[PDB]
Amino acid sequence: STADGAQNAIAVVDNALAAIDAQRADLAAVQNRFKNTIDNLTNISENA
Amino acid sequence: SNAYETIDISLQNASASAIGSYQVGSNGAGTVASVAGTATASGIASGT
């Protein structure tokens, strides 16, 4: 409403989006690891 | 785009019959003066 909000909400959402996008980057690393792993596993399976 | 980054304004409190000359000027607040608007023997004295 009056004094707190206009600035406190930004103070929240800054680190909020920071942590959310950090989790997104963690998931991105996980899935890049997964894609490299599935390529490696397919190659090893074909050689086997 | 940052918190508490604002621009202030000093708009007048009121343009009603309360604005005017914020001024007594002489000899009219509380008690009259001793030399100003008064016959004296020595006159205006030194000081600041």
From Swiss-Prot, chain A:
It comes from the Bacteria. It is found in: Secreted; Bacterial flagellum. Disulfide bonds: none annotated. Coiled coil: none annotated. Phosphorylated on tyrosine residue(s). Flagellin is the subunit protein which polymerizes to form the filaments of bacterial flagella. Belongs to the bacterial flagellin family. This is B-type flagellin. It comes from Pseudomonas aeruginosa (strain ATCC 15692 / DSM 22644 / CIP 104116 / JCM 14847 / LMG 12228 / 1C / PRS 101 / PAO1). The chain holds residues 393 to 440 of 488 of the full protein.
